[PDB]
Structures are given as structure tokens and as C-alpha cells.
Amino acid sequence: MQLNQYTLKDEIGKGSYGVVKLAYNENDNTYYAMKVLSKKKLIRQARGPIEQVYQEIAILKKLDHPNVVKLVEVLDDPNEDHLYMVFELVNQGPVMEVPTLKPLSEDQARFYFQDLIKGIEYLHYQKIIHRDIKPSNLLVGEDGHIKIADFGVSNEFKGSDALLSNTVGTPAFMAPESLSKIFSGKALDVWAMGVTLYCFVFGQCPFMDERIMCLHSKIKSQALEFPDQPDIAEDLKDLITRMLDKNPESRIVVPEIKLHPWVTR
Ligand SMILES: Cc1ccc(Nc2nsnc(Nc3ccc(C(N)=O)cc3)c2=O)cc1O
Ligand SMILES: [Mg+2]
């Protein structure tokens, strides 16, 4: 299929909505990742899915950082059902697959976690709360560095932080204060970064249940416990415990994560 200067090829992946296809650009002889979305399918899937897509378009047009995925072009005719989002091509796999029997080593987890810190610090500096941080939304670029993706449920704010009351995101990564109020958006992202880091070294989420009610009660009430294997350093366990503090008041903040001994060694 030909679309403007692009030759559409096979399906290579999926977004939270839409399919990703390989797209050859005839003008610069470079390949791109093209996310193909049906407006009709987004409407039937119902901030609903179509509002999530247009939020992401609006956020990604304003951002420029080495740890944020690059949106190159949007093809959207208002009288056509399909809209196309063209991104810089990255690795086919994300930072890691979850659940996995082969989790990251501690050096690799530190390297990717340092990228995640830089990316989240930039987003927070740009007044954006991501709200869906997880390994499958952490792409890996040609440079070998993390590129944050999926801005569909993000929130922009004016002032020092976002003071929010709604529950959005991926259930396994949602902070306990959002499942029981007004709460800090930055601390929600810190909790999800904690669930992500736990996933990097254990290959599984810290709180898991097939039943969404039970998953939520575990996030709110199950004390954090580390598996016996793999053995991980005490400083890493200490950092994860502080990021997965159920009380957002006492949860570690990003400036403090940057001075944590596991991060600085
Ligand atoms: C053989 C091969 C095949 C594929 C790839 N690369 C990709 N595969 S899948 N999706 C990608 N990029 C996105 C963009 C946005 C979103 C999103 N969630 O908005 C997710 C992934 C890729 O660049 C690389 C390869 O050498
Ligand atoms: Mg991999």
C-alpha cells in the first residue's frame, strides 16, 4: 500500500491502540514506524481512546529529548477513517518483555533506569505527568538508549505539580493513593518507575492478580516482598522500597533518586 511518500509494509507491533507497520520513505530512503489507527474502531472501543490518540499527537508535537520517542509526521484527513502517525524507527522489542524468566542484570537495569530518570525529569520539567510508565512503553533506540512512548493518558499542568483525582493507566502500575482524594502527579510517575524497576530485575510485577479488584487490594495492602532469586544488591532493594512506599507523602522524589547510592555508584 502507498501513502504519500510512504510504502506501507508488514505489521511490526502494536500501540495501546492501533497497529504499527513498517513504512519506507521514498524521499530519504529511510524506514519509519507508522502507527495506523481507525477512528471508527477507537470510537467503538470507548478520556476515551480517540481522545487519548489526539492528546498524544498534541503532546509529542511539543517535545524534543533524546529519551522521548520522536513523532516525525501525522497524516490525518478529517473525512477519512484512518489516521497515520510516523515515528523514528527504534528496536522492535522494548526495554524488556514482562513476565520473563530472563530479567535484566543489575548493570543493564541501572543503565536503562538512568535514561528513564532523565526522560521523566524532562517531562516533569516540561509540566507533563506521563501516567503510563511501564516497560512496554520504554522503547530502545539505535543509540541503545530508552525512548519513552505512549502519552495517551498524560496530564499537563500549570504550576509546580499536577493535583489529580482520576484513576487512569495500567492497573498493575497504578499507585495505591489513586485506588482508594487529591494526589500528586509526580508521585504517581515515581511509583510506576518503581514497579518498572522491580520488573527490570525480577521479570515480574510486584503486585499481581487476574482479578482487577484483588490486584487493586494488593497494591493498597500487600506488603512489598522480594523473591529469594535472583539475589539483588541491598542498595537496589532499598531504592525500590522507597519508590514503592504506599504513602505518597514519604515516597522518594526524583531529585532524591538521583542521589541514591545505587544510582550514583
Ligand atoms: C525488523 C524490525 C521490525 C521493527 C522494528 N521497529 C519497531 N517495531 S515495532 N514499533 C516500533 N516503534 C513504535 C512506535 C510507537 C509506539 C507507540 N506505542 O506509540 C510503539 C512502537 C518500531 O520502531 C525494527 C526492526 O529492525
Ligand atoms: Mg530485549
Non-local CB neighbours of 141 within 8 Å, separated by 6+ positions: 88, 90, 91, 147
Catalytic residue among 115, 132, 189, 245: 132
Question: What's the first-to-final CA gap in the chain, in angstroms?
Answer: 51
Q: What is the largest CA-CA distance in the chain?
A: 58
Ligand 1 pocket, residue 134 CB under 6 Å: no
CB 130 within 8 A of CB 189: yes
Cα–Cα dist 171/227, whole Å = 21
Q: Which of 8, 14, 20, 142 to mutate to test the pocket of ligand 1 (most atoms within 8 A of CB)?
A: 20
Ligand 1 pocket, residue 15 CB under 6 Å: yes
Residues in the chain: 265
CB 192 within 8 A of CB 148: no
CA distances from 20 to 5, 13, 74, 176, 204 (A): 17, 5, 14, 32, 25
Cα 164 to ligand 1 centroid, rounded to whole Å? 32
CA-CA-CA-CA torsion sign (229, 230, 236, 242): negative
Ligand 1 pocket, residue 141 CB under 6 Å: no
What residue spans define the domains of the chain?
1-265
Clarify whether 132 is annotated catalytic: yes
CA distances from 252 to 39, 111, 125 (A): 40, 20, 17
Q: Resolution for this model in angstroms, one decimal place?
A: 1.9
CB 248 within 8 A of CB 187: yes
Cα–Cα dist 99/122, whole Å = 29
Write out the residues surrounding ion ligand 2, Cβ under 5 A.
Answer: 93
Cα–Cα dist 194/200, whole Å = 10
Beta pairing class for 146-148 and 183-184: unpaired
Q: Which of 52, 68, 92, 147 to mutate to test the pocket of ligand 1 (most atoms within 8 A of CB)?
A: 92
Q: Quickly count: other Cβ atoms within 10 Å of residue 147's Cβ.
A: 25
For residue 17, give the 3-state DSSP assignment.
coil
Cα–Cα dist 233/226, whole Å = 11
Beta pairing class for 163-164 and 155-156: unpaired
Q: Which helix (DSSP H) or strand (DSSP E) does residue 88 occupy?
A: strand 82-88
State the structure-solving technique. X-ray
For residue 3, give the 3-state DSSP assignment.
strand
Comparing CA positions, the residue from 113, 123, 175, 190 lying closest to residue 151 is 123
Q: State the cell numbers at 197.
A: 524497576
- Rounded to the nearest 10 degrees, the angle between the axes of helix 185-202 and helix 234-243 is 150
Query: What's the angle, vertex CA 197, arms to CA 182 and CA 59, rounded to 5?
Result: 55
Q: Quickly count: other Cβ atoms within 10 Å of residue 160's Cβ.
A: 10
Cα 90 to ligand 2 centroid, rounded to whole Å? 12
Instruction: Tell me whether residue 16 is annotated as binding.
Output: yes
CA-CA-CA-CA torsion sign (206, 255, 111, 13): positive
Amino acid at 164: L
Amino acid at 43: I
Ligand 1 pocket, residue 150 CB under 6 Å: yes
Q: Which of 63, 97, 139 to mutate to test the pocket of ligand 1 (most atoms within 8 A of CB)?
A: 139
Ligand 1 pocket, residue 33 CB under 6 Å: yes
For residue 155, give the 3-state DSSP assignment.
strand
CB 239 within 8 A of CB 262: yes
